[PDB]
From a paper:
Among the various amino acid transporters, the L-type amino acid transporter 1 (LAT1, SLC7A5), in complex with the heavy chain 4F2hc (CD98hc, SLC3A2), facilitates the transmembrane (TM) transport of neutral amino acids with midsized to large, less polar substrates, including L-leucine (Leu), L-isoleucine, L-valine, L-phenylalanine, L-tyrosine (Tyr), L-tryptophan (Trp), L-histidine, and L-methionine, in a sodium- and pH-independent manner.
Interesting, the para hydroxyl group of L-DOPA can form hydrogen bonds with the α-amino group of Gly256 and away from Tyr259 compared with the Tyr-bound complex. Although the side chain of L-DOPA remains unclear at the current resolution, its orientation was modeled based on the available electron density and further supported by known interaction patterns observed in related structures. Given the current resolution, we refrain from overinterpreting the pattern specificity of L-DOPA binding and emphasize that our conclusions are based on the available data. The distance between the hydroxyl group of Tyr259 and the hydroxyl group of the substrate also underwent noticeable changes, with distances of 2.6 Å, 2.9 Å, 3.1 Å, and 4.2 Å for Tyr, Diiodo-L-Tyrosine, Trp, and L-DOPA, respectively. Interestingly, although Tyr259 does not directly interact with the L-DOPA or Leu substrates, its mutation may affect transport by perturbing local interaction networks or altering the conformational dynamics of the transporter during the substrate translocation cycle.
Residue numbers in the entry:
A (entry chain A): 162 to 630
B (entry chain B): 44 to 506
């Protein structure tokens, strides 16, 4: 129908000039196929292959969490080891990866003869309670780190006596506790320990000997860069928290200089960022700077360490009669029975779990962003110059979403004034970037904005995100 | 001068199993996990979805026998709804539904074949398109050569898909056999409830995606040797086994990977492969890619046949029914299909068309099932095989309607845009299907073009 019949077509399509045409077309198609294959293989070969992952351990993937006073964490009258197992959900809300419990051994005073690191103080709990806590944490994938300090209720933390016996007993305690299943250890105030470097090296060697998934934390109170670097002259896998970033912060350039000098001197290794070893953020900063530092500590190439109550801006001096070394957590308006009515609904965890304009919500968002992207996990860090009082830096791993942080430590507004031509072309910032979040309410999110006319409000931080260039 | 049966029941079972198993459970198990309830609840959802699909099968198992004509979902509604709706269906079908399907499957094949050369870094975009086009062209050439080879190719690739799924099941069971709690006891931890917008319901229109393709065998009917018993037997063999395979695969994934790990991943199959097998893990991705290969073949083996149906009625140009006299393969239809797929390759992103894919196919199925009972009422005396009652389909029909609801939830504007294509296709019908009155010049040109094409590629008409 509407075409040549079968017999006529088979009679007419046998002459030369039509079989040759079909053969030529077949040859052309089949050669074009091989040409496309060759093009595909050339495209595949001519491309950078990839960058291999650095095989991170468990403590590279998130922020730690310290607890200096177990009894005061959930209020008086309920301080016990088994009490913690009812709180991990809240901790699981913060998506932390560690839990640095306070010292729970038997130590009444500077007495040494009968101060043991192997017996749990009955005031806290029992060995079975500790085992249950560890099992529940393992089910929740929250690693537990146990503190060890011969004196935590006295004045001097090392008995002010010959350190051989305490070194031997803590060495025995390390191997005794590693059987139970602890995932690390922490020692504080090591600056008061004679011949610290040899002891730290031996302890690190012993701890790494049991497994490759164990951690050792060392804490000092000094802030001298040379002093900090001295303790690392024989150890490179130690995490040393110290008051290096404290006693300053008034000018943005000073903090930038401190961070850059520390990274240059340490040789770009894994370090831990914290404003102190056993104190909260409010003990060194005004109430208007917590958001700025909380944004700062989540985007540094390291493992942030926070003390308990630093996600709701707890203040020791805001409530009279509360010791500054152990503030009471504010779970509700009744969390402080003494002088009731002195706590508002804004300082309570339950009062901040639903308000996006609060520290806790920002804390949760930052923690979620830190433990998810590869650039914030093992990305490369590059800081470039900007205007005075500013701190701007970039994180970029290989080919993933690049992050750009801009911070205004100054008290007055100013322009951005960012400078290019000092980063590799693979890390050059684009003209327009998105805005993942801002610590100052009054701005929109998800809107790609230009970087040429960017202005910063006093004490404001920006977390722009842009894709591969 | 007409194509022969050259299909047995085993080939039909292989075709349906292969076309059901596409990317499916290999790429998107995370959805139901993070869209409704808890891990354990997800184990229920898939099963429920399977029952749904099974019910739908038991409709086409009878309707297909009712009107023994090729071109499923087109010739069946050709009778009830008249001429214009059938042509509209066929036109939008060929224009969007097929090329999207072939291109998506081919692109998935290319990506999961090229993955072992770019484990963490993303695969280059240029290479994937070229590999997909090469696969499509090679499969078109193979189908055009002889259907007999394509039958064994489809059989072998369906067997390979089943073997890969069985290996996945075996590894998932062995990683439990060593002794571990594997967090299976905690269930319904964050189940919540069905929200006002819909929480448990929200997972069904994503779970049903892997269960699609249960009517491709009805496209190439009347090419089967004694379809009367073979087609229902093929359906009954195919559906329960694939449903149980999917639910067991979901169990295997849940027993080896935590919720957080699954949420923080894109390709669950790659994680499962490199987790419990380590070196030489390339077996897991490559097989997946190989699977997609067979899938593409199946699509072609249906698509061209549908076109061969259309020109029989007159809705299509007379050339798109031509047959090579010595090789039965319908060459012009295959060339048309591959050309359409390659033209569809020129896009700007993925998933831009799949959004209304469910809307289109579900509305077509719903209209077909509605027409079934009206046809039965208007003609209650027929030689149908089971004389089954309309008890089962009616409920199914209502469920179909529910889908349109969700369809007009996410992108109603995209649906409105999609309607414009069929609205512009109405003039396509009016141009040549009905307005037979044409000037002599146009008829002469059409005849000259047709005879030129027949001279170029040796094809003789069908009788
Ligand atoms: C561990 O400390 C010692 C002190 O010299 C050194 O290695 C010791 O001796 C051999 C050689 O490595 C090891 O098999 C022992 O296990 C080490 N003794 C320990 C644990 O102190 C070296 O300084 C360090 N090397 C290791 C193994 O970490
Ligand atoms: C760290 O804390 C100690 C105690 O407050 C500071 O003072 C030292 O105290 C010990 C006694 O425990 C003395 O033996 C030292 O001589 C004191 N140090 C100095 C420099 O005199 C110590 O100064 C603190 N560290 C820093 C860097 O301030
Ligand atoms: C780390 O910074 C130091 C300190 O600037 C640099 O080492 C040399 O330091 C002296 C004194 O400042 C100067 O000669 C230069 O600043 C440095 N020498 C060079 C680089 O020519 C150095 O830039 C950085 N790298 C290290 C680890 O030395
Ligand atoms: C939570 O809300 C109460 C009620 O306003 C705050 O109490 C105010 O404290 C601010 C400084 O924080 C003072 O300027 C006001 O005089 C107080 N107003 C009243 C009516 O009490 C409470 O301080 C708020 N929380 C914080 C720390 O800002
Ligand atoms: N079911 C195919 C993909 C697919 C095939 C056919 C369909 O009709 C459909 O909607 C979707 C798969 O498992 O990957």
């Amino acid at each position: 129908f509407t075409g040549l019949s079968k017999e006529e077509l088979l009679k007419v399509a046998g002459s030369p000039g039509w079989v040759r045409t079909r053969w030529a077309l077949l040859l052309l198609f089949w050669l074009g196929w091989l040409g496309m294959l060759a093009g595909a293989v050339v495209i595949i070969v001519r491309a950078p292959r990839c960058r291999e992952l650095p095989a991170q351990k468990w403590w590279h993937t998130g922020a730690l969490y310290r607890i200096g006073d177990l009894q005061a964490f959930q209020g008086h009258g309920a301080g016990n080891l088994a009490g913690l197992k009812g709180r991990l959900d809240y901790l699981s809300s913060l998506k932390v990866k560690g839990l640095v419990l306070g010292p729970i051994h038997k130590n009444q005073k500077d007495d040494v003869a009968q101060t043991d690191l192997l017996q749990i103080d009955p005031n806290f709990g029992s060995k079975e309670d500790f085992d249950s806590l560890l099992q529940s944490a393992k089910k929740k994938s929250i690693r537990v780190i146990l503190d060890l300090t011969p004196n935590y209720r006295g004045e001097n933390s090392w008995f002010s006596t010959q350190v051989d016996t305490v070194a031997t007993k803590v060495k025995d305690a390390l191997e005794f506790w590693l059987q139970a299943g602890v995932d690390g250890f922490q020692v504080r105030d090591i600056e008061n320990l004679k011949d610290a470097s040899s002891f730290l090296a031996e302890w690190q060697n012993i701890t790494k000997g049991f497994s490759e998934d164990r951690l050792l934390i060392a804490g000092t109170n000094s802030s001298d860069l040379q002093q900090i670097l001295s303790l690392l002259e024989s150890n490179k896998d130690l995490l040393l928290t110290s008051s290096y970033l404290s006693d300053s912060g008034s000018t943005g350039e000073h903090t930038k200089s401190l961070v850059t000098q520390y990274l240059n001197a340490t040789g770009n290794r894994w370090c831990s960022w914290s404003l102190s070893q056993a104190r909260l953020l409010t003990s060194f900063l005004p109430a208007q700077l917590l958001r700025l530092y909380q944004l700062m500590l989540f985007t540094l190439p390291g493992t942030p360490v926070f003390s308990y109550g630093d996600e709701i801006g707890l203040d020791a001096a805001a409530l009279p009669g509360q010791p500054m070394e152990a503030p009471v957590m504010l779970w509700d308006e009744s969390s402080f029975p003494d002088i009731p009515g002195a706590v508002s609904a804004n300082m309570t965890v339950k009062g901040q779990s639903e308000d996006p304009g609060s520290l806790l919500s920002l804390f949760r968002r930052l923690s979620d962003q830190r433990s998810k992207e590869r650039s914030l996990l093992h990305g490369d860090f590059h800081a470039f110059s900007a205007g005075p009082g500013l701190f701007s830096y970039i994180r970029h791993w290989d080919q993933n979403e690049r992050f750009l942080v801009v911070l205004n430590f100054g008290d007055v507004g100013l322009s951005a004034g960012l400078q290019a031509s000092d980063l590799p072309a693979s890390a050059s910032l684009p003209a327009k970037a998105d805005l993942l979040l801002s610590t100052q309410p009054g701005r929109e999110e998800g809107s790609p904005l230009e970087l040429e006319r960017l202005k910063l409000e006093p004490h404001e931080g920006l977390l722009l995100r842009f894709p591969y260039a | 001068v007409t194509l022969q049966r050259n299909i047995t029941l085993l080939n039909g079972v292989a075709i349906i199993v292969g076309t059901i198993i596409g990317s499916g459970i290999f790429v998107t198990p995370t959805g139901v996990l993070k869209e409704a309830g808890s891990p354990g609840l997800a184990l229920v959802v898939w099963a429920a979805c399977g029952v749904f699909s099974i019910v739908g099968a038991l409709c086409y198992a009878e309707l297909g026998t009712t009107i023994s004509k090729s071109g499923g979902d087109y010739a069946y509604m050709l009778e009830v709804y008249g001429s214009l709706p059938a042509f509209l269906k066929l036109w939008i079908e060929l224009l969007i539904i097929r090329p999207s399907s072939q291109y998506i499957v081919a692109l998935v094949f290319a990506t999961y074949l090229l993955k072992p050369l770019f484990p963490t870094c993303p695969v280059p975009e240029e290479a994937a398109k070229l590999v997909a086009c090469l696969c499509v062209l090679l499969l078109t050439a193979v189908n055009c050569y002889s259907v007999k080879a394509a039958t064994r190719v489809q059989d072998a690739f369906a067997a390979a898909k089943l073997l890969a799924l069985a290996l996945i099941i075996l590894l998932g069971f062995v990683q439990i056999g060593k002794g571990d709690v594997s967090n299976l006891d905690p269930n319904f931890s964050f189940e919540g409830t069905k929200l006002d917008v819909g929480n448990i319901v929200l997972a069904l229109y994503s779970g049903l995606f892997a269960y699609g393709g249960w009517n491709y065998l009805n496209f190439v009917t009347e090419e089967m040797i004694n379809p009367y018993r073979n087609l229902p037997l093929a359906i009954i063999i195919s559906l329960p086994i694939v449903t149980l395979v999917y639910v067991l695969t979901n169990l295997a994934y849940f027993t080896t990977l935590s919720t957080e790990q699954m949420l923080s991943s894109e390709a669950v199959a790659v994680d499962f492969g490199n987790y419990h097998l380590g070196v030489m893990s390339w077996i897991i991705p490559v097989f997946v890619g190989l699977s997609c290969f067979g899938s593409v073949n199946g699509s072609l083996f249906t698509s061209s046949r549908l076109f061969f149906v259309g020109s029989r009625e007159g809705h299509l140009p007379s050339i798109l029914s031509m047959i090579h006299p010595q090789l039965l393969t319908p060459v012009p239809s295959l060339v048309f299909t591959c050309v359409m797929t390659l033209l569809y390759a020129f896009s700007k992103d993925i998933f831009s068309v799949i959004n209304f894919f469910s809307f289109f196919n579900w509305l077509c199925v719903a209209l077909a099932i509605i027409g079934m009972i009206w046809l039965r009422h208007r003609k209650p005396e027929l030689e149908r095989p089971i004389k089954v009652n309309l008890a089962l389909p009616v409920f199914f029909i209502l469920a179909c309607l529910f889908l349109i609801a969700v369809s007009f939830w996410k992108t109603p504007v995209e649906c409105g845009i999609g309607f414009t294509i069929i609205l512009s296709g109405l003039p396509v019908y009016f141009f040549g299907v009905w307005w037979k009155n044409k000037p002599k010049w146009l008829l002469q040109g059409i005849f000259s073009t047709t005879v030129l094409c027949q001279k170029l590629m040796q094809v003789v008409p069908q009788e």
